[PDB]
Ligand binder design. Structure first.
Ligand SMILES: Nc1ncnc2c1ncn2[C@@H]1O[C@H](COP(=O)(O)OP(=O)(O)OP(=O)(O)O)[C@@H](O)[C@H]1O
Ligand SMILES: Nc1ncnc2c1ncn2[C@@H]1O[C@H](COP(=O)(O)OP(=O)(O)OP(=O)(O)O)[C@@H](O)[C@H]1O
Ligand SMILES: Nc1ncnc2c1ncn2[C@@H]1O[C@H](COP(=O)(O)OP(=O)(O)O)[C@@H](O)[C@H]1O
Ligand SMILES: [Mg+2]
Ligand SMILES: [Mg+2]
Ligand SMILES: [Mg+2]
Lengths: 422, 250, 422, 250
């Protein structure tokens, strides 16, 4: 109690003594040193008995509550904590060891919490307030910060800080979860490093966005990637990624920036890969042009339950584009652009699998001929109801993209993986 | 109270408790004044306390007793036509707030899509009330709402999303005599060509009306021994209670 | 650190001392002199000790930040730097020797970067902001600038400057670069010389403008050619050429001279050929009216990835060009006006080719029927990853424009070229 | 008076009473000066006094007699172009005033959409009046009004929204002699493919002309014994009267 009362009195005296504007004009170190000196002077004036270590701790706490992020500062400092969820000024949960636990950490009130949220978002230039209550940002260290303002959040401002978990979205997870056999994982790595044009089609609940993240994990760091997403969820580890997001039309139906506009602009930014979050309309056309215009390596997710259905869907969107393109022209465009199609599906037992890794071999007259490098064969189920299956390589020793692997020097890895898969 | 009012039989109450505690994806349809919101508030009583629930409502009505609950409210545009925060925006953000469940007060627009997305993307247990007089009408309304979102999704794609997202639909109806009844508890079995196939686990059958004018009926289990969501119950260890209740209602 | 801290302090003092609006009202030289004087006065007041060179560098940096292009100035000045990519305030890459390299250059924050971007786009009358997040433009010095605003660019304003190339290609170079076979070059010479209403279509960076310049090389010197452009890309060698450029609306939204007005006036300047730098709006209609009402030989660049898409784009441009006309009316107007379509395109390897030389044969029902005189067939890929293909003539010995070739005595060479390559 | 003026047969009057009382989403279409507002004013007489009715108008024409009625009027923009309160805003607010029925004085803009939403989300009995010379034209007009109402929706989406929302269409019309009649009482049966299928419960057949030049005709029931809204009648115990009226004027 004595420590809390002393801290409250010292903070009140400092606030009444130093104008926040002057500190705002000074760097963090200078402001912190000045605040420490002022707090020491205030403690001397008030004649508060405290140890040197206790005084330093109180000064650091005051600085954090003034300049830093207040009570969150220890939590952010800790590394075991993965996520921080502040629901109003009085409830703070932390995700430790994969489980969410309530914490005794509390804020002074919703005003201090809102100030801390505003500081955190502004750290990257974003602004949150009643005019713009919802804010979502990605801090330079990879952490994701989401803030909701009191007008929308009944119980006060809400803040979610998800620290970056590097190892969650990795091909190791897919291999261990049996989503893809190790040989399939190696072939997928080859495909990603070969700059093959990918279309990651999947059914509902197949988690093809996680698969797209896993595939983007293989992009060479030097390549200038550009990602278009309706609602940004990809997290690429490469250092030269440009992140874009479509703007939905306002309630008057104006100001929309559709995915097609984003991809069209992406064509003019000198990118090396274009990663469309999900293709649902005419953007397909544009994406395919990007795949054919020279930005080989572009990826894109798609809603379809089989590679053939994915091709049909792509044709349907291109036709929806409104251009007078005959079906044969669209089929030729698809064959020219797309290299590999990866079909991921959620099986009967709710488990995710990469059912197909297939190749768009060509166009026979009017039928797009595709060959499957890898397939998932279901052979039964467990007594638990779990589905039993195995990933089998079709045995195609020379996929159409073998030349790209040879050019990049990955031919040997590709051949080894294909032989091992059998 | 609902059991006392004969709205749902005790076996139906046990089945509803299992459904709620199993993190089953839910849609609580119903007619006008049929108690959709009250039923949803009752079902949220089965949510585990440790789960991080997030609530979106046009008008704050739900009162969850769990500790880790986040309540959000839409902001209608002022007369200047500015500052609107539609429920679609709330659900879009909720997908970012790392929740265990998303509780939408009432799905009446494009937010349906986002809600359905929440059900696909690991937020198992999301609930949402909906205005419809039967589970078939509820599914059709969901399809229409998804189409209102402006995405160029075909009908087949929307039906596939609904089948993969929604697990159970609870149809509560208000009868002629002003009585509230949970008419249906029906799963979304799957999707045959162009047609979503549902199976009713629990059905309220009206045998007529008493001389007082009140409708007389009873709740009956359809006899489906293994509901589609049986695996989830087994995972949570409630499958035995589910089977016991379904057999008893039979 | 001392130099950077002193620069930051001096900039803060200058900001607190003068209003940037007043300096903006003044000319560049006067504003720079005033800024230098104020910086020297502040340094004297601040008692900042530094060398004459350091003081001059600080003054120059302050002047550039106030009115220049900020840290981009050293990069823009450098000649070896081909492209500059600013992915937010803290990431700047430069393309040197064809390789992208990260640079230590940094902006103060996304707000400074957004101000710099707005200055650069306004330099050519373009405005980029939240309402108009995307802005593409071509600067007078030939460089092209693409900008995306924070609402779409999640990580901050995204800027891409692709600097001008000092040289332009000729038909001999295109034949040398295999962009078109010698027979294709001869057929193009016949098409250009014989006053064929021409449309150059292609994708981004396809080479439409270079191809258009090479085509204009075939016009007779006597003909009075009027060229309408934005930024004046073309360089015609003929003596009787009138170069016109559109004027974008000022910040007040007045004084706009759209390309439609330029074409409408061109109809009244007694030209033989009207050459539109790029058709992107209603001018299409007018241009077609010019093609079909005595100004034979009028050419125009269009953005389209195939002749079918080019025709559809022209039709849509006419449709939205104010006047309400039946679709069949626009279709037969296009058929009557346009004689040939040339499709410049990029291949998957980034190389450029003239994929199609096509004739607008006619209109059957509501479908425009065209015939390809020349087509580029891709037959595989080489060991270095470069696409491999060949140009082949469809064998049509009597193209629709044969009469024109006859009119100018070019029919014999047209037949020779159409026969030699097949 | 309308029965006296032969505008509608007594059986037609009884069927209209059943339709109004049983909370049927009504659209009273008609040509200019054809009696739309008068017909709507008469129809409102069947609403239960207990129901909270909210009337939106541009000119304050209706004179409902019920005790619990809220009268709202739109405000046209001032000469400066500000202060406008369109009917859409009034309906959107009405959704938040806890009404039972929303009565729009005339649907001519985006409010149609909102109104239909109100009809389809618990505000059963909402009546509107529309300018159209036939029920088919009324449906097409409603579809167009939804279409231009900002939101971009598929045509089939709007069509099935109309089918779900609107229950009955009443076609007030003016005859060649200047007299007024209720030509059609029609049910929106459903949607087949992309065509809305409707059935006429009552139709006015013109059989000639009299010596004074006045048109001569008669109202006849199509004979449909079980109209789509029959259930609603059952809900209110009016099914007996609906059957009697539909049979007495075959
Ligand atoms: N056939 C070719 N071979 C090699 N380089 C070429 C060829 N055609 C054009 N280029 C070069 O490629 C770039 C294309 O620029 P150009 O202005 O011709 O393209 P464009 O079609 O007008 O594009 P934009 O969409 O930018 O207007 C220039 O560097 C040009 O020099
Ligand atoms: N069925 C009827 N029989 C006789 N007279 C009628 C009948 N209906 C309306 N009238 C008379 O005709 C007038 C028409 O005005 P009313 O408001 O009913 O028309 P409306 O359909 O709303 O037309 P408007 O397009 O002007 O809104 C009524 O005021 C009443 O005077
Ligand atoms: N199962 C039920 N049994 C008895 N009364 C109920 C029941 N469900 C709801 N109610 C009553 O109905 C009223 C309104 O219900 P509400 O929650 O608005 O349903 P909806 O949201 O579907 O209209 C509540 O005040 C409640 O007391
Ligand atoms: Mg409710
Ligand atoms: Mg050009
Ligand atoms: Mg009227």
């Amino acid at each position: 109690d004595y420590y809390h009362a002393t801290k409250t009195t010292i903070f009140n005296a400092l606030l009444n003594t130093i104008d926040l504007s002057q500190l705002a004009q000074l760097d963090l170190k200078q402001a912190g040193e000045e605040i420490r000196d002022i707090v020491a002077e205030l403690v001397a004036i008030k004649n508060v008995s405290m140890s040197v270590a206790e005084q330093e701790h109180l000064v650091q706490d005051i600085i954090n509550d003034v300049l830093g992020y207040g009570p969150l500062e220890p939590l952010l400092a800790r590394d075991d904590i993965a996520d921080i969820m502040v629901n109003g000024a009085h409830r703070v949960f932390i995700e430790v060891g994969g489980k969410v636990q309530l914490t005794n950490v509390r804020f002074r009130d919703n005003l201090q919490l809102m100030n801390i949220c505003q500081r955190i978002v502004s750290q990257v230039g974003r602004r949150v307030d009643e005019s713009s209550p919802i804010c979502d940002a990605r801090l330079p260290d990879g952490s994701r910060v989401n803030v909701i303002a009191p007008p929308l959040a009944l119980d006060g401002p809400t803040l979610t800080i998800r620290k970056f978990k590097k190892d969650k979205l990795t091909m190791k997870n897919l291999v261990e979860f049996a989503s893809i056999s190790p040989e399939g994982a190696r072939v997928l790595g080859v495909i990603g490093a070969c700059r093959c044009n990918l279309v990651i089609s999947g059914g509902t609940g197949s988690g093809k966005t996680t698969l797209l993240n896993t595939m983007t994990a293989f992009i060479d760091p030097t390549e200038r990637v550009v990602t278009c997403e309706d609602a940004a969820e990809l997290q690429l580890q490469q250092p030269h990624v440009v992140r874009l997001e479509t703007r939905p039309p306002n309630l008057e139906g104006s100001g929309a920036v559709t995915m097609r506009d984003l991809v069209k602009n992406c064509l003019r930014m000198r990118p090396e890969r274009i990663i469309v979050g999900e293709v649902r309309g005419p953007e397909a056309f544009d994406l395919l042009q990007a795949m054919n215009t020279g930005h080989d390596g572009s990826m894109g997710t798609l809603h379809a339950n089989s590679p053939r259905e994915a091709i049909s869907r792509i044709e349907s969107m291109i036709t929806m584009g409104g251009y007078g393109l005959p079906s044969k022209t669209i089929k030729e465009m698809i064959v020219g652009s797309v290299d590999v199609i990866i079909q991921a599906a959620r099986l009967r037992d709710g488990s995710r699998r990469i059912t197909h890794i297939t190749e768009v071999v060509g166009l026979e007259g009017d039928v797009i001929v595709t060959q499957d490098l890898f397939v998932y064969e279901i052979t039964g189920e467990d007594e638990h109801g779990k589905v039993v299956g195995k990933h089998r390589s079709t045995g195609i020793a020379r996929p159409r993209f073998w030349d790209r692997a040879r050019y990049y020097g990955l031919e040997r890895e590709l051949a080894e993986a294909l032989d091992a898969a059998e």
